[PDB]
Design a binder for this molecule. Sequence first.
Ligand SMILES: [Zn+2]
Ligand SMILES: [Zn+2]
Length: 229
Amino acid sequence: GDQRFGDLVFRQLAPNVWQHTSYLDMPGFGAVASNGLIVRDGGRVLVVDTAWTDDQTAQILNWIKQEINLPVALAVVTHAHQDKMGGMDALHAAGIATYANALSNQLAPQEGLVAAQHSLTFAANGWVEPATAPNFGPLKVFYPGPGHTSDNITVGIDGTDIAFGGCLIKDSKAKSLGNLDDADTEHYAASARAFGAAFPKASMIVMSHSAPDSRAAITHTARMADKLR
Ligand SMILES: [Zn+2]
Ligand SMILES: [Zn+2]
């Protein structure tokens, strides 16, 4: 989106929404982008996903201070992998309340990650139990079922055409589903489709590892995941 701050990139997606992007050198893959979101809700800022590292995550907070200059109220993190929860310490150090799927917090220690302070639980229909997501504002949080990981969750932003698939969703031209080490091969395809069904009005699909795409990204992803079963 062209805003470069330190080693991160910030792209405005809507008047109150930005994508944050951080990079990690992974031999044999290159310098790998990971995307999250920043949302302004009135007088506060909400964050979706950390950067890969604590330092990068501190940089996200520095950008927010400089460009928005409102307090960060809370952060929700999609799953227990380094690109989504690598920077938990920086959020906690800043006094930011953090939230994750209960299962993500249970998985975090063995993954070498810090758990969020708070656990989300999910209803029958996959939607977050409201009582476990206080003050989430426009963030609508949905568990689509196991896919990229057992614990992967997704987030739509109310008042926008934006839904965030995290690492569940790949772009419409992706040549693979990327990392499948912790993937649920049987359930991935249905979980990807369920994400689309939860946010039917979303025309902009934000994801971890490619620039924002149309709903064709969901279509393409589920079709790749089909070949896993
Ligand atoms: Zn992951
Ligand atoms: Zn990822």
